[PDB]
Design a protein around this ligand. Structure first.
Ligand code: HEM
Length: 153
């Protein structure tokens, strides 16, 4: 699969709004992930004790981790598919150190789409959401191929 430039521009135009406040978007996305799929919280040894959304919102560590994760995703998206170099360390850590199944990358993709749909109707109409889904699908397809090369799943 290959995105068109027009599709990449829809992706980047909503990402530009994420970047007004990546920390707040990261909190919403990670909290949505943990609420929709609580099993995913068990993968975060630093956070797995948190019991409520209030505790999650107050966690400086969770906020910082959301900034780190979304910034890495943003760098991937800005490569517009030419992301081999960026996927290498991310695939290795997520396959081998953190043990994140592809299914959980699907869950976080769903959380990203949900939060962008809620926060950014001006830049996340149907065409823009379709483009973001395509970009995240490409990300997951390429990282899954790397997982397999690395010996995981
Ligand atoms: C868009 C998808 C994702 C991106 C771009 C991303 C990015 C990152 C980055 C950059 C780091 C720090 C460097 C590293 O260890 O690789 C990290 C750490 C981590 N990620 Fe992800 N991640 C994603 C999805 C997930 C998911 C779905 C989970 C679990 C369900 C997860 C679990 C973790 C954990 C446990 C750490 C270590 C956190 C810590 O040290 O406290 N990641 N991630």
């Amino acid at each position: 699969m290959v995105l068109s430039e027009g599709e990449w521009q829809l992706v980047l135009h909503v990402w530009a709004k994420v970047e007004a406040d990546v920390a707040g978007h990261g909190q919403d996305i990670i909290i949505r992930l943990f609420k929709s799929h609580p099993e995913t919280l068990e993968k975060f040894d630093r956070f797995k004790h948190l019991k409520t959304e209030a505790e999650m919102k107050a966690s400086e560590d969770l906020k910082k981790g959301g900034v780190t994760a979304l910034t890495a995703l943003g760098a991937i998206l800005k490569k517009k598919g030419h992301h081999e170099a960026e996927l290498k360390p991310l695939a290795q850590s997520h396959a081998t150190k953190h043990k994140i199944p592809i299914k959980y990358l699907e869950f976080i993709s769903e959380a990203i789409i949900h939060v962008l749909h809620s926060r950014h109707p001006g830049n996340f109409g149907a065409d823009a959401q379709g483009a973001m889904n395509k970009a995240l699908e490409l990300f997951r397809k390429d990282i899954a191929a790397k997982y397999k090369e690395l010996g995981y799943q």
